[model samples]
Target chain A: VGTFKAKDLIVTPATILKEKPDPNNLVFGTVFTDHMLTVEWSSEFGWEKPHIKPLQNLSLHPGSSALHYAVELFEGLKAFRGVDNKIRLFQPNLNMDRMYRSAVRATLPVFDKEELLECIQQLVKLDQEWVPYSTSASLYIRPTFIGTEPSLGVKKPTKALLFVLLSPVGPYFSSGTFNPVSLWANPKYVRAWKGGTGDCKMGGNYGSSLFAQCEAVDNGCQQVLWLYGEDHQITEVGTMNLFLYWINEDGEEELATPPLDGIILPGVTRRCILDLAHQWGEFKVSERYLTMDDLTTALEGNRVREMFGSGTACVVCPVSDILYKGETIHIPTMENGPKLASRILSKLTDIQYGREERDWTIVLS
Target chain B: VGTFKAKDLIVTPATILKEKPDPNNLVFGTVFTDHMLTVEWSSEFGWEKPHIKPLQNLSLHPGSSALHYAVELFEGLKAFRGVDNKIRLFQPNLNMDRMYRSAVRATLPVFDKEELLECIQQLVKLDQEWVPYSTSASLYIRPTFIGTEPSLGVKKPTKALLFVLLSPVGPYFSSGTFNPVSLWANPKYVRAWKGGTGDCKMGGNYGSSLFAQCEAVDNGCQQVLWLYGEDHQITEVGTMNLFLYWINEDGEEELATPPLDGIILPGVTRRCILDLAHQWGEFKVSERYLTMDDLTTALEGNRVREMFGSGTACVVCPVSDILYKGETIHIPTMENGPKLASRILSKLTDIQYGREERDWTIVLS
Candidate 1:
C-alpha cells in the first residue's frame, strides 16, 4: 500500500542462460543481459514488490496509455568494468533525478529514487559479467518507466510500470578513431520549444525528433542541429547537447553551450563537461544562446575553435560540417584536433575506467 | 513482399465470452468487446496476415521503440446502432486517411488505407452486438499503430504492430443535458507550434499536453483554450477543435475556426461543421485565426454569439467561460440557447443515428 521497496525484491533465475555475444561485435542497445528488473504501481494500492527475473517480453494491456498517449520516459547510463575488475556506475543519481522529474512531467506515479537505485545496483551486480572487459566498451543501462493504465483517457495515469534493461555496447567509434559528423541545420523542423516537454527525458521528445533526423539523413548529413524560433537559436544536435568553443565578439575565448532553458535537455554528459571546465578554469565558460547568425559570423571571422556534441552514448562527438540554407558551412573541428573535446573525453573515460579515482563512480560490490 | 490484404484475415472466436455490462451503466473506454484485431509488420516482410481473436494483453519486448521513443499514433471513431437497429460507422475513411498521414509523420511503416478500413469493418461486424442499442450510447473504436522494433535507437522502426480495440461508451453528457464548460487560457503553455507534429495524431502530442490540462483543472477550469504566438491566437480547446460564432469587426456574422496552418489538428468533426455551414449558406463561414483581442472586442460590443469545441468523443461541447489573466471572461453561449452549436450537433447526430439519410455513414449489412 506504499512505495516499492528494494528489500522485498523477488528474483527468479533462468533455467537456461543465453550465450554471451562477442564483445567486439556488439552494437548499441541490441544485445542484452540475462536478467531484467520490473516494478508495478497503481493509484489505489501504490507500488508493488520489485521483481528481478529472466529477461522476457512484457505483457501489457491493449489499451495501455504508454502505447496510445506516449506516457513514457527513460534514462540511460553505463556500468563500467574498471581496470581493477570492479564494476561502477557513473553518476547514476543524476540520471535517477532527471528520470524522476520526467515522470512528474509525464504524469506517471513517482517512486523513491534511492530505493530504485539500490534495486538497480542489485540487478547490475547480478549481471556484472555482462559489463565489457575493454575500456572502450561497457554495459549500457536503460531505466524505462511507462504508464500502464488500461484505458484510453488523456489524463494522469492510475497505473504504471518501471523496468530496467542492461545491454553490453561497444565503442561509439568502431574504428578506434574519432570521426567527426556532418550536421544539417534547418529551421523548418523544430526538435523542442519553449512551453513544451523538451527539458524532460520523456519519450515524446525523442519520437518527434526522428522525422527531422530522417530529413538530415536525406540531406546527406549524419545528424541534425536543431534550431528554434525565427532567430534560429541552435538548441541541440540529434539526441545530444551542443557545445561550441570560440572567441566571442568581445575577443574573449570561451566555452559556450545553450542555457538550461525549457527547450534544451540537461544532459548528464553536458553537466559533467561543464563541471570539468569550471574545475580546470582553463577559459571563460558561458551558458548562453548561440544563434545561426552568431555562429556564421564566428566562422567567417575565424573565431570558432571547435564544435561538438555531448551525451551518454558518445561522451563527445565532434562536428565537422553543417549544411545550412542549401550551402555547406565547413567547421574545422577535426582540423584543430578538437583539442578540448578530446581532452574532456579522455578525462571522463579515465575516471570511468578507474584510471583516476573520483567520487562520481559508485562501485557495486 | 507487399502490403497486407484484407482477404487474408484470420479469425479466432472467444471460447468463453464475458457478460456485457448494462448499456445504461456504461462508461467511456472502460469495458471492451469480446474480440479485437491485430496485424504485424516488419522490414523483411511487409505485413503478416491480420488476426481477429479474443481480447487479450499484448506481449512486447521491453526495448520496443513504442515504449521508449513514443513511436506511436492512433485514430478514434465510433460505431452506432441507428433507430432501425442497423450498425453504422460514421466517416471512418477520414479517420483512416488522417491515420496514414500520422504514420508518415511517426516514421512508422505505411499501410493501405482501404485495406485497413475493410479489415476494421470486418472486426466491427464480428462485434456488432457490442454497439449500444440506444442513440446516446455507442461502441468506441480505437485504432492504434506502434513501432515494435526491439531495440533502443531513435530511427525508423524495422518492425511495427497495428491493433484495434472496441469499447462500449455511454453518453458524454449524462442526465441528457448539454452542460457548458469553462476554460483556462494561458500563453505560458503552448500545445503546438509551427514545424511541430501538431497536425498529426501522434501520441507525443497528447502526452505532453496533460500537464497544462492539470493546471487548468487546478484553476477551476474544465478544459484549456490552447493559445499560440505573441498575439495570443486561440488554437484549440483541450483535444477538440475550437469554433466561434460571432460578428466580426467588418460587421459580418461568421462561423470561424483556426486555419489548418500546421499547428491545428484536422479533425473530422471540424470538417463536418464547416461543410454543414457552407451548405446552409446562411452566414459567413471562415477558416481563419481568431486572436484573444478579437474575441474580447466582440464580447465587449455584444457581438459574440457562442463558442464550442468539436471532437469525436463529444460531438459538440459548448464553452461558457474563459479564465485568462486572472479574470473570468463570460461567454453568452447558453443565453442564446447556443443555437448554432445545437443545430450543428443535431445535424451531425441525425446522420449518425440514421434519422437523416447521408452518404457519410457506412451501414453494416
Candidate 2:
C-alpha cells in the first residue's frame, strides 16, 4: 500500500458479493469475484493513485488508444483453494514480471512490480471465498494494462491503466470426461511468422487466431494447427504450445516442442513441462522444430506416441488427429504415449495445492 | 439500440460530465468523455445488449481470452459540429461496417452493423452538447470489441464484449501545426506485410508498431515509415497512409501512394485524397508502390515535389524530413508545398462544413 504513497490514487471500493456462480455450470471466464486490483499511470507524474477497487465499469473515453492502436498487454496465472483450506497462488511473481516486460514493449508506463504483486495478493485475499474447494476448480487471475488516453490518433499513449481481476473456473476440455480433441490444418491463413508478436503473448496474437480457429470448426476440426513460413512448417496447434513424443528413425523416443524462435510464445506451462522432463532424463527431451513431415513419418512408422497441448488452464490435453489438406491424420492419443499427461497435471497441481513441497507455490500467510 | 434487445445489459448512467480539458492543450486521444459503451457477446447469440454506462472497471478473470489470447478489435472515426447548431458525423457507417468485419475476422461474433451504427448515432446525439462548436474541434468516436471469455485455454471465445465511447479533440499533429513532420525509418521490424491484417485496422497492426514507434520517437521523428517486402518498399506510415509526388526517371510528375496491396490499409482519408488528386489534373495520380529507391532517385535528380499523410483526424499532414541511419532527407514542406497543402485543407474543410460547393461532403439527415 505504501508503494503507491508516492503517487495519488482514488480507490473505488467494489460492492460486496451480491452473487456467485454455481460451479456446476461455470462457463469459461464468465464469473467474477467482489474485488479487483487497479492502478493508473500518466507520463506527467509516472504512476498514479493505486487502489483496491470494486468491480466497476471502466470510464475510459471511446477513443482511448488501446481501443484503436492496441496499446495493451496482459498476464495470466491461477490461484486455487489448497487442501490446507487456504487460497494459494502459483508463481504470481512470474506473471507480474512478464506483465511488466510486456508493458514496456507495449510502451505502457511501468509500475512497482513487487508493489503490484502485493496489491494482487490483497485482492486475492479479499476474494478467498471465491476460490472453489473442488479439485477441478480454481481461481483464474488476469492482469491487464491498456493505454487509456482518449484519442484516435495513432501513437503511444501518454496515460494508461493496469488492473487485475479473479474468476472461479472448472476444467477447460470436458467432453463427457477425458476427451480427445480434433485439429484442422490450414496453411493458407498463417497464424504467425518470423519477427512477429506470437512470442510476446500480446493481445493481437490471440485475437488474430479467431478467424483460422473458426475455419477449423467449419471443417469439423476442433482447433486450427498453425503452420509458419513457406514450407507450411508447424508452429502451434489451436493457439496452445505443441508438445508430443515420438520414436526417432533410430527407434529411440523423444519428447519435443517447437523451439522459441520468436514465432512461438514462451508459455509458462510449456516451460514447466520441459523442466519436468529435464529432471527425469528417461527418454529424450528436444526443443527443436518438429514439422508435419516428422509427425507423419513417425506415425507411418508406428513410432508416434502422445500428442497434446499445455497451457495454464487445461494443464495438458492429448491430441487425437490432424485435419491436414482436407484429410484427417489420426495421431495416436493414448497408445504407448506418455502416461505423464495426467501425471504432469497431478504433479503440477500438487505443487499448486502445496501437497508437494516446492518453491512454485507462494503460500500467503 | 436494438443490437442487444434479447441479451441482459447492465447499465450505469454517467454521474456528471467528466471535466474536459482545454482544447489548445488537447493531446490527440488524451481526454475522454463522461461515459462509455459496452456490450457482451457469446457464441450462442451474435451480440448482447449494448449499454451507455458510467466509466468503471471491467471485472475479468485472469484467464479472460483477451488478456492471454488477444481476441480484440476496434474502430476509429469522428463527429463534427456544424454551424446549424446540429451535430454531424462523418461517414461513420464505414467505421461501423469495418468494425463488424474485424469482429468477424477476430471470430468474436457476428453483429448487426446497421443496428450498431444506429446505437452509435444515438451516442453522438446524446453527447452532442459535448462536441465543440468549432469546425476544427470534433468528437472522436471509438468502437471497440474484445474477447471476454475467462479461461487460460486459448480457443474461439465463447463470450465477447463490444463498446463505444466519444472524446472531443483538437487536431492530430503537434509538429505539423503548419510545417511537416519527420518519420523515422527502421526496415528490420516490418509493421505489416502482404497477406497481413495491416489493411484491417486491427489492434495487432498497432501492437506490432509500438517498439518501432519508440525508436522513431528517440530519433526525433513523429511517426514511423513502415516498409514491406525484401526491397524495403514503402508500405504505410505507422497509422496513416503515405503519399508522394516525384519526378519519374523520364522527368514526368507522378503522384503515388502505396497501392492497396494486402499490406496497406485503405484509409477513408487516403481514399479522399486520392479522389481529390484524381480530379486535379495538375499532376499524374498513380496509385502504385513508391519504393525508397524511387524516392532516393527522385531526390537526387531534383524531382521530389511533396509527401504527406492523409487521415480522418487531420485532413492532411506534410512530411518535411526523414531521419534515417543518422542522416536526414529534407522534403518540400514550405512555399510551393505550403500553398498546395493549405489549398487542399481549405477545399476539403469547405465541403466538410457545407460551406464549399462540393459533391463529397456527405450530408446526413
Candidate 3:
C-alpha cells in the first residue's frame, strides 16, 4: 500500500481563473479561490497521488457513506495576508492534529500529518494572490475529510476523500464591531455529552447542533450557551469555547473555562488564549467546570467580570446576557470594557498580522 | 414557491440496464437497481420537479453542508415480492413519517410526506423486476435526504436533495438460520442521550456509532449493547431497539423495552413488535427503563426468558450473551428456543410475504 507524498503531487492548474470577490464586501465562506486540493484513498490501494486542481463540483456516488452515515470530519484555519504583505498560517499544526484525531474517531483512514500540511502549504502558496489584502479579512481554509464508500452498511469505510477549500472572509460579526451577543441557555438541548463524539471535530457534532442554534435564534438570542447535567455545567457557547472572567467563591480573580473531559472540543484558539494567559501570569488561570448557579450567584454579588466565547472565526466574542428559564441574567462584560477579552484578541491578532513576530505563525515564503 | 408533486415526476429509463445480481448470493446494499429517484429543494424556490432516471453519481459542490456538517438523514424499508408474485411495501408510511421528523431535525426544507411516498411507490413499481422472489430476501429501499447548500456555515441549508435507491438483499444474518449474537455493554460509550437527535434516523447518529461498534468486535462480541446514564441504563443494541422477555420484579411474566423517552429511536419494526405483543395478551408488555443491574438480578433469579433486538434489517435478533465490565453474562435466549423472538419474526414475515394478507402490506398494482 502506497502513502501519498508531496513530491508525488500532481498539479492540474485551471485554464482560466475566476474573478476574485471584493475584499471589503467579502462574507464568511461564500466565495472561494481558483484552486482546491483533493486526494482519494482506498483500503485496497492506499492513498492516491495528491492533486491540486481547479475548484469544481465533486462527482460522488449516490450511495456514498458520507451522505448516509455522516462519516466526515473537518478543520478550520486561516491564511492571513499580514501587515508586512506576507502570508502566514497561525498554528495550522494544531488544526491538523485535531483533524487527525477526528479521522480516527470517524473510522476514516489516517495519514501523515506533516505530509498533508506540506501539501496544504503548497496549495496556499500557489494561490497566494487570493489572500485578502486587508488585515480585517483573510482566506479561510477548510480542510474536509469524508468517507466515499459506495455502500450502505454501517461499517468502517473502505474509500475516503480529503479535500481543502479556500474562502475569503471578512470579520465574523458583520458590523465590524465587538458587539456582545446574547445567549439562550437551557438544559433542554445538550450540545455534547459524556461517551459521545463531542470532543472530536466530526461533522456529526456540528450538524446535531444546528437545531439548538435555531431555537436560540427564535428566543431572540444570538447563540446557545450549551448546558450539561443536573447542576447545569456550562459547556460551550455556540460553536466556540466559553471563557468566564470572574471572582471565585473564595474571592480570587480567575479566568476559567471548562475542562477537556471528553465532552469539550480542544479548540486551537482556546488553547492559544489559555497559553497566553498563563504566559502573562495574570491573576489565576484555570481549566475548571463553571455552572449556571455559580454564574448567577457571582452576577448577583457583582463578582462577574467578563464572559466571552473564543474560536478561530472571531478570536473573541463577548457575551452580554443569558436568557435562561424565563429569566434574563445581565452580564457586565461590555461594561467592564471586556478588558481581558479585548487584550487577548489584540495580542493574538498582533502575532497573526505580523505586527509581533512569534513562532505560532508559519510565514509562506 | 412550488411543492414537488408525484404527478410532476419525470422518468428517464436507462438505455443500458445493469445485469441484476444473483438474488441468492445478494449482500445488503452492495448491488442496486437500474433507476433511482431524486428531487431538489431550495429555500428561495421550494421544491423542483422530481426525476426518476438511471442510477448515477450526484454532482455536488465541494462545500455541501451534508458533507461538512452532516446535514443528512435517511430511511430504510423494503419492497417484498411475495409468494403470490405481488410486490408489497411493509408499513412504508411509518418510515415516511419518521423521515419527515428527521428532515425537520436536520434543518432541511420540509416536503409533503404523501408526495414523497407516492414518488417512492412509483420508483419501486417501475423497478419491481429487481425485487427478489424469495421470501428470505427483498428489495432494500433507502430514501436519503441531504443538505446540498454550497456554503460552509452551520446554519440551515438553502438547497437540499432527496434521493432513493433500491438494492436487492438477502437476510441480515449470513446464515440461513436464527443465530443469536453476543453483545458488549459498556457505559463508557453512549449511543443516545436525553437531549440529542437519537430519536431521528439522522446520518450523524450512525456515523458516531462506528467506533463503539469496532470496539465491540475487538472484544469478540458481534454488536454493542449501548448503555447510558450513571445507572448504566440499557439504551439500544447496535442500531436496533432492545427487548427483554422476563419475569418482572413484581413476579409477573412480561416483555419489556425501553420507553420512547426522547433517547430511543422509534423504529417501525419495534412499534410493530410492541403492537403484536399487546395483541397477544399472553404476557405483560411494557415500555419502561431497564438497567443492567435489574437484568443481572433477573438472570440470577432464573427469571430471564429471552432477550432480542428489533430493527428493519433484522426483524428480531436474539441475544445470546452480554460482556459487561469485563464480566461475561450468558443469556438463555437461544437455549430457550428464543420462543418469543421466533414467534414475532414468523408473524412479521407472514404479513410481509402476504401469507396472512394484513393491511401492513401495501400491494402495488
- lDDT of each residue in B71-167, candidate 2, tens digit only: 7777777776666655556666677677767766777677777667767766676566667767667777878787767555557778777877677
**Candidate 2 structure quality by residue, lDDT tens digits, A1-365:** 12353134454555555577766567666677887777777777777667876776566555566655667777778988778776777877777777877776777776778777777777787777788877677888878788877556566687787888787887776432557778888776766655566677577776667787778788877777888765567777775789887787677778889998877877788988998999988878989887788789888888887898887867787888898876779987766444767677788888887776777778764
lDDT of 1 by residue, B136-232 (tens): 8889999999999998877889999999999998887666579998998988888888989999999999889988888888988878999998899
Q: What lDDT score is found at residue B27 in candidate 1?
A: 65
How much lDDT does each candidate structure score? Answer: 0.91, 0.72, 0.91
DockQ of each: 0.83, 0.37, 0.86
Per-prediction count of colliding residue pairs? 0, 21, 0
Candidate 2 runs further than 4 Å off: A1-25, A44-63, A81-88, A175-177, A193-195, A248-252, A301-303, A338-343, B1-26, B30-72, B78-93, B108-168, B171-177, B249-252, B280-284, B332-347
Better model by DockQ, 1 or 2?
Answer: 1
Q: What are the runs in model 1 whose C-alpha is more than 4 Å off?
A: none
Where does candidate 3 chain B have its weakest 10-residue lDDT segment?
B19-28
TM-score of each: 0.98, 0.84, 0.99
Query: Alpha-carbon error at B41 in model 1, in Å?
Result: 0.4
